[PDB]
Design a protein around this nucleic acid. Structure first.
Ligand SMILES: Nc1ncnc2c1ncn2[C@@H]1O[C@H](COP(=O)(O)OP(=O)(O)OP(=O)(O)O)[C@@H](O)[C@H]1O
Ligand SMILES: Nc1ncnc2c1ncn2[C@@H]1O[C@H](COP(=O)(O)OP(=O)(O)OP(=O)(O)O)[C@@H](O)[C@H]1O
Ligand SMILES: Nc1ncnc2c1ncn2[C@@H]1O[C@H](COP(=O)(O)OP(=O)(O)OP(=O)(O)O)[C@@H](O)[C@H]1O
Ligand SMILES: Nc1ncnc2c1ncn2[C@@H]1O[C@H](COP(=O)(O)OP(=O)(O)OP(=O)(O)O)[C@@H](O)[C@H]1O
Ligand SMILES: Nc1ncnc2c1ncn2[C@@H]1O[C@H](COP(=O)(O)OP(=O)(O)OP(=O)(O)O)[C@@H](O)[C@H]1O
Lengths: 362, 362, 362, 362, 362
DNA sequence: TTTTTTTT
C-alpha cells in the first residue's frame, strides 16, 4: 500500500508547522506503536499525543518511503499558501480574532490539569501591570482598537521615560499579544534599507530605544535614530504604499504597519511630535521595585513579559461585548473560570500588597 | 481520472493571478463541497465565489495530486507569458484602455449591490482634488496624453513645493490610475543598479522626493539625489534603449518609462530643468487644511490617494469624445449614473464648502 | 533483492552522523567481509566494530547501488530532523543530561580495554584544577545549575585577573563541558551585529577578553569591549527575546543564551557590574606554574583544558542524588570504578604534590 | 548487458582520482583494444597501462552509455568520502606514515626501471640542501617530530633572514613534504579574517615574512603582520580552540594548526617572541648561490624546493629505527640503493663542491 | 530507431568543438539531404562539408529527439575531458607539436584549391614582419624554447618601447601561435584576484602595458602593474604552484603559465627586472608605416597580427632539424612548396620594398 | 553555484 500525502498535509495544517525539518521529525516519531508511546503516556507535547494514534498507520508506511522530503515539502507549501491567502484577504479584526484564539488554546493547556502554570501567580502579574500605569486596562484596549482601525496619521504611539521604567516590558507584552517585530533605527543611514525589510507582512512593529542627540548633556548617549525617523515620514503616516527589501530578494510594496516608539528623555523635534497620536510617560516607582524583590517568581517565569498576562487583564477587566463576536463564547467561559478562582477581595488584597511594596501574596 | 491542468490554467488566467502560492491557496479552497461553502454563501470574495462551483470537481482531484506545485508553476507562467506578449504588441493607448477597463470593473463592486463604498463620499473627494490646482482635470488630461505619446526628450513632469503641499498625494493617485512604480534616487551609486531594475516593463515611474544639496539655506537636508539624477540623463530622455537589472537575473533591455519627479525647493541645475517638460508648483493652503480637519473620512478611507478618484474626476469633467473609442460605452453609462445621483448644484455646493474650509458635507 | 534505506537510517541515527560524506564513506567499509576485518579485529573505532557484522549484507547490496548519494542524503536529513525536534522540545536539564551521556560514552572508550588513556594521568588533572580556586567543585556545580535554570538577570558570571591566571583555561573547559561559543566584542559598534549572530541556538556564550578603556595606564591595551557591553543590557538580562543577524540570512528571534565574561583588571561601570550574579578573582600562583612545569604531560595531552576533567571532578566530589536521575546508574558505576582505581591517599598525595609545586606524580 | 558501476568505482579508488573530468577522460581511453593500445605498448603512463586490459570490456559498454557523467560523479564521491573518513579518524602519525609511502612510491618509479630520472641528480640536490644549514637532517627530524606532537605552546619555530636567505625555499619543500599552507598576516586586520579560513583542515601552516607594522623604520616595508601576531596569541600556542572565517561563508572552530613564522629582520615584540620554540636566523651564502649558478640542474628541475629531496636527505642520514614502524623495511630498501651506489666520499665530494661553490658534479 | 549518441560524440571530437550551442547548431545543419546541400556544393566550410554525408542519417533522427541538449552536453564533456587528460600528462613539446599540426592543417586549406588567400600576400606579410626587429625568426626561436623548457625565473620577457611599437602586434601573433590567453595586470588587486582563474590549463599568458608610477613622470597614469608584480614575483618565477579560481568548477592548483609582459616604456624595479630574462625595445619607423599604407591587405586581412605569419616565417628561416621531430616531414613539405614558388630574390625585393616603405607588391 | 550580500 502507499503513503497518503493528504494525511501529512492535514497534520501540517493542524499543527500549523512550516519548517520542513520540524514537520519531518515530528511525523517520524509516530512510526512507533502509540499504544506504548511514552510521550503519549506522559502527555508531554500536544502536537504529539493528540495526533499519534490517528497518524500511526500512515507514519509506518511513510517510514519506508524513498520520497520523504518531497512529501514534506508539498505539505509545508500548503501551510505557506494558506498564510498568503489569509494575509491578502482577512480583515484586521479577523486577524486579531485568530491571534486570540491561538493564545486561548495555549491557556487551555497551560492552566489545564496537565499544565504547569499557577493561575494565581499569573493573576499576581496582572495586579502588578495594572499598577504600572493609571487606567492600564483602558490604555491597552485603546491601543488595540487603534491598531485594528489603522487610521492614517493616527497610527503611532510614543513611550518615554528613564531607563528601568518598564517601557520595554510593556512593549514586549503588547508585541507578544499582537505579533510583530522589533526594529533598530539607530543604524547608519545605509543599512536601514534592510532593517525595514523586517516589517514585511507584519501586524505591528516596535522601534527600540531611539537615541537622540544633545541629551548626552543629561548623560543620554548620542545617536542618529531620531534624525532617521524624522526622515521616515511616509512610513509612519501610513498614507501611501512603500517598497521593502530583503536580502537576495526583489522589493515588495505595501502599507507600512503601525507600531510603537520607545526612548529616554531626548528632546523631540516638533515635526516628529506631530506624528504620534499618544505620548505615554513612564516613571520609576520604588514600591514596584520593593515588591519585585519579594515577588521574584514573576521575573523567574517571565510572567510580566507575557501577552498571556495582558489577555488575562482584558478578560478580567473588560465587558464581554468588546471582544469579537465569535470568541465571546470562549471569553465568557474564561470569565467564569476566573470568577470561580478569585473573589474580588483576593484580587484587591493583592493590589494593596503591591502598593505597599510588600510581596504580592499573603 | 486525472487532474486537468487546462482548467487550472483557465482559473489563473481569469483571476490574472501570478503568485504561485496565492494561486495554489486559492485553488485548494475549492476542494470542499461547493454547496456548503460559507465563503460562497456570504459572497465574501468574487475571486472565490464566482469560480468555486465550476472548479470544484477538478479541485477535488487536484487535492490528491502528488504534483501540485508543478501544475501551478505551469499556470503562472501562462499568465506571465501573456503579459510579455501584450507588453510587446499593444499600443500605449490600448494598454491604458485595458487598465481603465480594470478600474471600471472595480468600481462596479465598490458602488454595486455589495456597494461597500459611498459614491457621495468618493464624489466629495473629487471636489477636494479639483481645488488642489488650477484647471485640475485639464492638467490630468494633458499628463495622460503626454504619457501615451511618450515623446522622447519630452516625457517628464516636475512637482515641487513646501512639505505638506500635496506632492506625493497627487503622484500616488496618478500612479494607481496608470500603474507603475515609485523609486528612490537618494542612494549610494552602487545600489542604483538594482533600484533602477524595478522599472522593468512599467508604464510610469515616480522618483520620490529627490534630495539636492545646499538646501540648508531653506532648512532642507541635503543628499545624493540631484547630483545623481544629473548623471542619468539618457534614462530621462528615453531616446535609446537601456539595460536593466534584477537580483540573480540577466539584464533586460528596453526604453526607460516616462514619469514624474518630486522635490522640495532645492535649486536645480538648469540642465536638468531643461530636461523637464513641465513644472507644477504646489503650495500649502489653509482652507484645505481646515476643510480636511472637518472631513477626515477622506483621509480615513484614503479617498484622496486613490486612482478611482481621478478616474471619477475625468468622467465628470471630460467629453466622451476624449476617451478611447472602445470604453466610450461604459463611460456614457457611468456619466448617466453620476448625473442621476448628483446635480450640478450639489457638486457646486460641495466645492463651495471646501473653499470656505468647512466640512464638505454640510 | 534491494537496499534497505531503513537500515542506513538506523546506522545514521545510532552513530548520530550528519555529514553525507562521512556517512557514505563509513558505510562503504562494511562491504568487505567483517569476518576478516582488520579494523574489527584491532577494535579501533567503535562506530565500525560495533556495527560491521550487523550491517554487512545490506552494505554489500548498497555497493551495487546506482543512486547511493540520494540514500545518504535522506539518512542525513533524518538525523538533522531529530536535532530540530530536540532543540524545540527538550528542557535545558534534559539537554545537559544528553550532553553528559555523550561524554560518559567516550570515557568508557578512553579508559576501557582499548586503554588509549591513563585514568591516573587524568586524575592528576583533576587535582590541579581543584587547586586553581577554592571550593572548585562547588563553584562548578553552582555554575551548571545556574545555566540550567537560566533565571533572568541572574545569568552571567565575571572572571577577572592578570594574564596567565587561568581564566581562559577554565572558560574553555566549561565550554567544552556544556557546548557553546566564544565571542569577541572589542569590535566597532556596527559589526557587533554580525558577531552576535554566532549565538543562534547555542547553550552558552563566552565574551572573551573584553578590553576596557583607560586600563592602559596599567598597560591594559584599551578598546571598545566594555562600552559595547554597557549598551547590550537587554541581551544580558535575558528577560525578553532579541534579534540575531547572520550573513546572507534573515534575522532570527530568541532569548540570548547565558555565559561568562573574562577580562584583565580594567575598571567597570556600576551599570555593567550590577548585571553579574557573581565575580570570581583569578590570581597567578607560583606553585601552579612550577607544578605544570614539572608535570607537562598535562599540557601535552591537553588535559586541564578538557571538560572530561570537569566531569571526573564532579564524580569524585559530589553526591549521586545531585546528578539527574537517569544517569545516576552510570555515575554509580564510575564512582565504583574510580574508588577501586584510587584510594584516597593516592589523591591526597597528588594534591599535596601540587601544593608543593613538584610534579604531581611523585 | 550493462556498465558495471562498481568497476569504475574501483578504478577511481585505485587511481585515487578525485576529478570527474579526469576520471571520464581516462576511462574512455580503455574502449579500444589494449592488445594494440599504443599507450600500453610504449608503457607511457602507469595509471593507464596497469588497468586498460582489466577494464577493457566494461569501458566499451561505458562508451555506449548515456549517463556517463552520472556514473563518474558517484565514483568521485566515493574517493572524497574516503578522504573525509580518514581525515577525521586517524591521528597525525598514521597520516604522516601514509604521506611518506606516497613519496616513497614515487621515488620507486622515478629512479625505477624507466630510468626517467637518476637519483644522482637528486644527490647533488641533497648535498646542496645539507650544506644549506648545519646538521640539516636533524633540524628536519626535530621539526618533523615537533609538528607531529603538536604539543601546546611548543608549536612554532621562527625562520629569520634577509631576502634570498632561502627561508621561503625551505618552507616550500616542507609544505610539499607535509601538506599545508602559507598565510599573509600582513593583510589589513579586518580583511585578514576572511583569509584565515584557508587554515581550515590544514595539517601545517606558515606565516609569510611577518612585517613590522612600523617595520619601514628598518627600511623594510611596513605591514600588519607583527602588529597582528603581537596580539593573536593562542592561535600559535594551540592550547584551546579558536574560530576562523571565509568570504561569503561561515565561521569554523579548530585548534589552529602548528607552523612556521618566517621573517625578514623586522622588530619583534616580546609577546610574539614567546611564541617560538626556535628562532633560527640564517643568511644568503656566496658559495651556495655560486654553486647553483654552476649547479643549475638543481633549479632546472626545481629540486631544492621539492620535499622529495628532503625525504632523500632523511633516508641517507636517519637510522631505519627512526621511521614509522612498518615502512622501516622500505627505509632499508632505499638505504641499500643509496649506500651501494654513492660512497660517502662521493657524497662528501658533492657537499664539498657546494661548500666551494663549484659545480656539484665532476 | 534511435539517435547514436556515439556518432555525435565523434563529431565533437572530430571538430574539437567545445561549446554546446555551437555543436547543436552545427549538427542540425546535416538534417537536410547532403546530396543537394548548397554548403557542400559551395564547399563553404570544411567543418560542414567533410561530414554532412556521413552524419546525414544520424542527424535526421537527432532532429526529432526531445532531449537534444542533453546529447550535446555529454558530447561537449567528452571534448573537455580529452583536454584535461592531455593537460596533465603531455610533455610541453608534444603540446606545441599538436598546436602546429592544427595551424598547418589550416594552411593546407587557405592556400589550397579553396585558395581563399594567397601565400603571395602572406609572404609579403612575412617580409614586413621580418623587418620589425633584427633576425626576427631567430628571436622567436629563443622565445619558443624558453616557453617549452619553462625553466624557473626564465619564464617571462618584457617588450618595451613607445606606442605604435608593434609590441601588441608581436604579442598577438605569439599568443595565436601558442594558443595562450590574455590578462590585464593594472587593476587594484582584489578584482584581479578572481580574474586570474582564467590562467587555468594554458600553455601561455600575456600581460598588456605593465605600467605604474614609472610613467607618471611622463604623466602616463599608474596602472597597478608595477604595484602588483613586485609582490607577485613568484608567479613570474614559476618555482612553485598555487591554487586558482573558477566559477562552478573547483579551484585548481597549478604553477602559473610562463608568459610575456609589455610596456609603453615606463620605469621598472630591478627586483622585477630580474624576472624579464629577456627585455627587448621596439621603436617605429616611417617606412614601415608607408609600407602598410601601400600594402593595406596586410592590415585588412590581419596578416601582420597573425601567428600563421610567424609559422610561415619559421618555416622559411629555420633549419628542418630545429623543429620538433615528428612533424619535420610536413616542415619539409612546406619548405619545398615555398621555394618551389618564391625565388629568394622576389622575397628579398619584397623586404626591400618594405625597408623603402614601398608597397610590397610589384 | 553564484549571487547578492558581504564586504568595505
Ligand atoms: N515603573 C518601574 N519602576 C521601577 N522599576 C521598574 C519599573 N518598570 C520596570 N522596573 C524594573 O526595571 C527592570 C527592567 O524593565 P524594562 O526592561 O521594561 O525597563 P526600560 O526602562 O523600559 O528599559 P530599556 O529602556 O532599557 O528598554 C524590570 O525588570 C524591573 O526590575
Ligand atoms: N496644499 C495643501 N495645503 C494644506 N495641507 C495640505 C496640502 N497638501 C497636502 N496637505 C496635507 O498634508 C498632508 C501631506 O501631503 P503630501 O504628503 O502629499 O505632501 P508633501 O509633504 O508636499 O509631499 P512629499 O512627501 O511627496 O514631499 C496631506 O495628507 C494633507 O493632510
Ligand atoms: N593560577 C595560575 N598560576 C600560574 N600560572 C597559571 C595560572 N593559570 C594559568 N597559568 C598559566 O597561564 C597559561 C595560560 O592560561 P590562561 O589562558 O587560562 O590564562 P588567562 O589569565 O585567561 O590569560 P589571558 O587573559 O592572557 O588569555 C596556562 O597555560 C598556565 O601555563
Ligand atoms: N642561503 C642562500 N644562499 C644563497 N642564495 C640563496 C640562499 N637561499 C636562497 N637563495 C637564493 O634566493 C632565492 C630566493 O629564495 P627564498 O625565496 O627562499 O628566500 P627568502 O630568504 O625566503 O626571501 P624573501 O624574504 O625575499 O621572501 C633562491 O631562489 C636562491 O636563488
Ligand atoms: N616598427 C614599426 N614601425 C612603425 N609603425 C609601427 C611599427 N610597429 C607597429 N607600428 C604601428 O603601430 C600600430 C599599432 O601596433 P601595436 O598595437 O602592436 O602597438 P603597441 O605599441 O603595442 O601599442 P599600444 O601600447 O597602444 O597597445 C600598428 O598597426 C602599426 O601601424
Amino acid at each position: 500500500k502507499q503513503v497518503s500525502w493528504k494525511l501529512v498535509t492535514e497534520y501540517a495544517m493542524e499543527t500549523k508547522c512550516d519548517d520542513v525539518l520540524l514537520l519531518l521529525g515530528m511525523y517520524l516519531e509516530f512510526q512507533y506503536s502509540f499504544e506504548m508511546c511514552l510521550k503519549c503516556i506522559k502527555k508531554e507535547q500536544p502536537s504529539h499525543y493528540k495526533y499519534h494514534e490517528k497518524h500511526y498507520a500512515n507514519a509506518a508506511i511513510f517510514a519506508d518511503s524513498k520520497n520523504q522530503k518531497t512529501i514534506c515539502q508539498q505539505a509545508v507549501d500548503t501551510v505557506l499558501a494558506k498564510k498568503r491567502v489569509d494575509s491578502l484577504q482577512l480583515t484586521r479584526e479577523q486577524m486579531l480574532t485568530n491571534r486570540f484564539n491561538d493564545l486561548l488554546d495555549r491557556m487551555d493547556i497551560m492552566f489545564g490539569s496537565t499544565g504547569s502554570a499557577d493561575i494565581e501567580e499569573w493573576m499576581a502579574g496582572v495586579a502588578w501591570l495594572h499598577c504600572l500605569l493609571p487606567k492600564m486596562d483602558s490604555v491597552v484596549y485603546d491601543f488595540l482598537k487603534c491598531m485594528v482601525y489603522n487610521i492614517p496619521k493616527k497610527r503611532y504611539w510614543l513611550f518615554k521615560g528613564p531607563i528601568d521604567s518598564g517601557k520595554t516590558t510593556l512593549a514586549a507584552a503588547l508585541l507578544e499579544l499582537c505579533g510583530g517585530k522589533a526594529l533598530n533605527v539607530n543604524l547608519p543611514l545605509d543599512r536601514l534599507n534592510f532593517e525595514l525589510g523586517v516589517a514585511i507582512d507584519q501586524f505591528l512593529v516596535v522601534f527600540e530605544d531611539v537615541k537622540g542627540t544633545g541629551g548626552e548633556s543629561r548623560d543620554l548617549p548620542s545617536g542618529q535614530g531620531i534624525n532617521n525617523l524624522d526622515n521616515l515620514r511616509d512610513y509612519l503616516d501610513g498614507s501611501v504604499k512603500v517598497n521593502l527589501e530583503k536580502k537576495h530578494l526583489n522589493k515588495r510594496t505595501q502599507i507600512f504597519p503601525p507600531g510603537i516608539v520607545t526612548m529616554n528623555e531626548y528632546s523631540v523635534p516638533k515635526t516628529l511630535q506631530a506624528r504620534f497620536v499618544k505620548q505615554i510617560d513612564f516613571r520609576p516607582k520604588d514600591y514596584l521595585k520593593h515588591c519585585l524583590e519579594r515577588s521574584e517568581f514573576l521575573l523567574e517565569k517571565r510572567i510580566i513579559q507575557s501577552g498571556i498576562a495582558l489577555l488575562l487583564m482584558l478578560i478580567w477587566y473588560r465587558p464581554v461585548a468588546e471582544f469579537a463576536q465569535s470568541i465571546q463564547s470562549r471569553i465568557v467561559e474564561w470569565k467564569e473560570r476566573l470568577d470561580k478562582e478569585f473573589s474580588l477581595s483576593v484580587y484587591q488584597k493583592m493590589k494593596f500588597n503591591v502598593a505597599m511594596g510588600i510581596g504580592v501574596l499573603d
